[PDB]
Amino acid sequence: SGFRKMAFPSGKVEGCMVQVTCGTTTLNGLWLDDVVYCPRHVICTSEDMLNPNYEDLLIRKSNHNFLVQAGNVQLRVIGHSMQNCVLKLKVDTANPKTPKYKFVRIQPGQTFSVLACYNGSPSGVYQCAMRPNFTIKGSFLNGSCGSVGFNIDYDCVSFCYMHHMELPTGVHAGTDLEGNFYGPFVDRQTAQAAGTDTTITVNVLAWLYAAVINGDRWFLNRFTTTLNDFNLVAMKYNYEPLTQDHVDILGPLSAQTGIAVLDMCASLKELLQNGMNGRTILGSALLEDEFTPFDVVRQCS
Ligand SMILES: O=C(NCc1cccs1)[C@@H]1CN(C(=O)c2cc(=O)[nH]c(=O)[nH]2)CCN1c1ccc(Cl)c(Cl)c1
Numbered sequence: 001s002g003f004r005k006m007a008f009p010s011g012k013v014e015g016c017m018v019q020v021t022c023g024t025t026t027l028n029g030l031w032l033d034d035v036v037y038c039p040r041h042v043i044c045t046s047e048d049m050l051n052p053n054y055e056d057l058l059i060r061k062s063n064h065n066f067l068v069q070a071g072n073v074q075l076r077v078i079g080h081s082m083q084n085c086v087l088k089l090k091v092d093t094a095n096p097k098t099p100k101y102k103f104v105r106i107q108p109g110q111t112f113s114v115l116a117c118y119n120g121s122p123s124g125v126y127q128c129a130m131r132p133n134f135t136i137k138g139s140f141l142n143g144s145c146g147s148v149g150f151n152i153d154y155d156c157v158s159f160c161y162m163h164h165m166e167l168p169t170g171v172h173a174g175t176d177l178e179g180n181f182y183g184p185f186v187d188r189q190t191a192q193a194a195g196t197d198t199t200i201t202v203n204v205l206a207w208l209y210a211a212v213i214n215g216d217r218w219f220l221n222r223f224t225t226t227l228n229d230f231n232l233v234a235m236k237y238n239y240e241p242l243t244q245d246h247v248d249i250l251g252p253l254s255a256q257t258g259i260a261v262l263d264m265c266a267s268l269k270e271l272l273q274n275g276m277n278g279r280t281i282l283g284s285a286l287l288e289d290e291f292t293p294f295d296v297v298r299q300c301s
Contacts, residue, residue, distance in 0.1 A: 003210050003282050003299055005290070007113035008152040010125040015097030018075065019120030020089070020146065021067040028117040028146030029068065029089070030162070030177070032098050036068055036075070036089040037177060038146045039164050040082055041187045049189040058082055069120060070095070084179025085187050086162065103177040104151075104158040108132045109200045109240075111292050112149040112160050116140060129203070129290040130161075131171075132240060133195040134183025138163070138172035148177075167194050200289040201239045202246040205264055206296045207288045209253035211281045213300040218279055220259065223266040230265040237272045249293050256301075 020029040020038045023045065029038035043057045063077040066089055079090030106112060111129045115122050116139065128136045128149060140147065140163060149161030164174040164187060171194050173185040185192055208219070231241050247261045254261050268287075276285060 001214055001301075003214055005127045006295075006299060007125045007127045008150065010113065010115045010122065012097075012099040012152065012157050013115045013148060013150055014122045016095060016099070017115070017117050017120050017122055017148075018068055018070045021069075022061070022065055026119060027143065028120055030146070030148055030159070031068075031070060031075070031091070031095045032101060034091050034094045036077075036091055037162065038087050038089070039162065039175075039187070040085050040087045040179070041145070041164065042087060044187075052188055054082060054187075058087075071120075082179075085164065085175050085181060086177070086179035099157045100155050101157040101159060104160050105176040105178075105180070106130050106160040108134060109203060109292070110160075111290060111295055112151050114138060114149045114161070114163075115147060116144055117147045118143040127290070129200065129292075130182065131194075131197050132200065133197040134181075134185075135167060135171040135173050135194045135197075136161070140166060140172055149174075167192065169194050199237070199239045199287070201234055201242050201268075202249065203289045203292055204239070204268060204287050205242075205246075205250055205261065206253060206293040207282065207291045208264055208267060209250070209257055209259070209293075210291065210296040210300050212257045212259060213253075213296075214282060216281050219267045219271055219276075219281065220263075221267055221270065224260060224262045225266045225269060227262065227265075230262070230269060233269045233272060239272075253293060253296060253300075 016031050018029045018031045022042045025042050027042055029036040040054055044052055066077045068075040075091040077089050078092050081088045108130045114126055114128050116124045145163055147163040151158045159177045162175050166172055175181050250261045
């Protein structure tokens with residue numbers, strides 16, 4: 001029993017983190033086989049931030065301008081190239097700790113573990129969701145760029161996020177490991193801001209199932225709703241539409257608890273319209289939307 005924000009064990013990723021320094025800028029890199037990946041903004045200077053031409057900036061670099069350190073060991077850079085918004089630094093040593101891995105772009109609403117790193121040294125690990133607006137509500141300080149997000153399946157690390165920036169509201173934005181930004185954000189100085197966000201309905205339902213499995217039943221009722229009627233309420237409260245595929249995805253949790261998905265939707269409707277009346281669900285006085293159905297199945301009986 002119990003239900004926590006639970007990250008994947010980070011050891012396989014820890015062995016891949018390195019420090020990358022160019023000029024006076026230091027950030028983190030990801031060392032897999034004989035390549036180190038890092039944000040291309042490592043080559044920026046504050047004196048050219050409006051519209052940096054990264055192709056020009058990189059042409060003016062040499063391998064020796066990049067200082068790469070794995071712990072106390074310096075890795076010799078033997079090639080450099082740009083892929084979208086990431087830099088690929090070829091090094092003369094393959095990382096002996098390279099896990100089995102994939103580069104996999106995630107969908108808004110999915111979750112992943114973040115290994116926050118500073119100076120190539122891992123500092124902490126926590127669970128995040130990709131918001132509908134393509135930001136993440138992370139916890140990152142100066143020097144955190146190049147930290148990565150990932151999921152682990154069996155022995156295989158699926159890298160999905162590399163950290164690039166903190167937006168004015170304190171939320172975070174980054175790229176997949178092919179260097180393509182999540183959402184409409186750019187690695188140049190602008191007034192860019194997080195767009196309007198919504199609540200991840202399928203995840204809230206998953207979390208209500210987690211609560212039932214953990215003995216919280218006070219929000220249950222005898223009523224059911226239709227998908228159409230529920231989605232009218234979802235719209236009013238800035239929740240994402242619920243699809244039949246979401247309903248299907250929630251099947252296993254519905255079967256384990258014996259509560260039909262549309263039955264649980266009727267509970268969610270009442271919670272949106274009435275609040276909780278001073279009660280809590282899984283230790284929260286709000287509706288939590290950062291656990292996917294998969295996350296719930298992973299922790300629940
Ligand atoms: O978001 C930034 N600056 C605003 C922007 C300027 C242009 C685009 S965004 C980050 C902030 N930053 C951190 O180390 C840091 C990270 C964090 O999460 N929290 C935190 O307090 N600090 C230094 C690098 N810096 C940056 C510099 C150049 C570029 Cl091009 C980019 Cl993308 C990022």
